[PDB]
Structure formats: structure tokens, C-alpha cells
Amino acid sequence: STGILTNKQAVARHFGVKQSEVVYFSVGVDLGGYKVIYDKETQRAYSLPVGIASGTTAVSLSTAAVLVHSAGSVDLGSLAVSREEYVTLPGSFDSGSTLNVKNELLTYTDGKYRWDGIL
Amino acid sequence: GILTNKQAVARHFGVKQSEVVYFSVGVDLGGYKVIYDKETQRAYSLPVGIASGTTAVSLSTAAVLVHSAGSVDLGSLAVSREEYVTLPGSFDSGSTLNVKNELLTYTDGKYRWDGIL
């Protein structure tokens, strides 16, 4: 919609890429040429690995941000970590929380932490 | 207007568009993760655990939020979460700091003011 276009614009400004380089995830969508992917259900965006060929289509995107496509698979959470693209969850260790992605950080009194174990 | 702004703000904090609320007197703060001040055009993560039915009373230029249950300095909360705004200019240009999460750039790095605002 128009809301989809303005959201691509907000996502793009956040990552510093072009509006057109943002793609919403949907089963079967062509992923080639895109730089960032947006999960409309979780409302989280992730940078995409460079090199996805045109013709490569999306298959599934888990809540742990694991993306399966026609040519293979990629953990977008891990990739985001390597790129220091993080989401700082609301609350803290004291308030408790639930982590679902590798790029989520929980704040403790001495700084932030990411979970490297089972999600 | 508001809807596209909630989008921009939500994508900045990594929350859902429906988890962003605008400040206004009386607004219900339950379940929201980020509050937006339309006057100063600044956004702040809200502390967790604000009971449903808790309504906003006032929001100062220093980002001190007063509500039904009590009050919270969103500036300090923002600092605890490393969520800052880097003001335009520098110590050379001079500036005015209004919130605890505002940074002023100097020749050797950035600084936040921990005194009277």
C-alpha cells in the first residue's frame, strides 16, 4: 500500500540504503538485488547477504530470523550480529524478557548482552 | 502524518508501529514501548511494567514523564539503554542541552550533561 511504501522508506533511512532496496518477506518473493528484508509479522528488518541471484525466491522466515530461500539458507540474526545491527529490547534483566533473535540485546546494570545459546 | 511517524519511530527502536504512543494529557500508557513528544519531536523508550489504566499527566522539555502511578525521567532511562541524540554542532559552536540523553560533540569525543538542565 502507501503504508508499505512509507515503511520501506523508514527502513531504508535506518539502514542508509535506497527505498527500492527494501523487500517485504512473502512466500515466493524474488529476493535478488535487495539489501534489506522486512518481516511484516514481527516488524523487524534485517540486512540481506550480498550475492542473492535474481530468480532466487523466498521460502520461509522464522521468528529467529532464519531465512530459507530457493538457493539455500541464511541466519539473518547472525548476519545482523556481525554487522552490529541490534535491537535493544524493552526492559532489562531485572524486569525479565524473552529473546527470539540473535541480534536482540537485553540491558543489565553494567551494559548490554546478546544471547549466544538456544533460542 | 502520525501513522507514518509511528512507522519511522518504530523502525528506529525496533518495535511495532502499534507499540508507539504519542504523548497527550490523559493518554493511556499501558503496553506501549516507545513514547513520542510531538512538541520536541523526540522519542523515548518507556519503562516496562506500566499498568493498564495508567494515564499521562505531563511531559517536560527535560523528558520527565508524570503519569497516574508516578513519574519517570525518560532521559535517564534512555542513557541506561544507550539511546542518545547527538545534537547539531559542537562545543566550538556552542549549544543548549535539554535532556539527559543529548550528546554534544567535542574534539575528542561526545559528552552528556549530568547536572542541572
From TrEMBL, chain A:
**Binding residues for Zn(2+), per the UniProt record?**
H14
Q: Where does the protein end up?
A: Virion
Q: Any idea where the Tail spike TSP1/Gp66 N-terminal domain is? A: 80-119
| Residues that span the membrane, as ranges | none
Q: Which residues form a coiled coil?
A: none
According to UniProt, the name of this protein is: Tailspike protein
Q: Which gene encodes it?
A: orf210
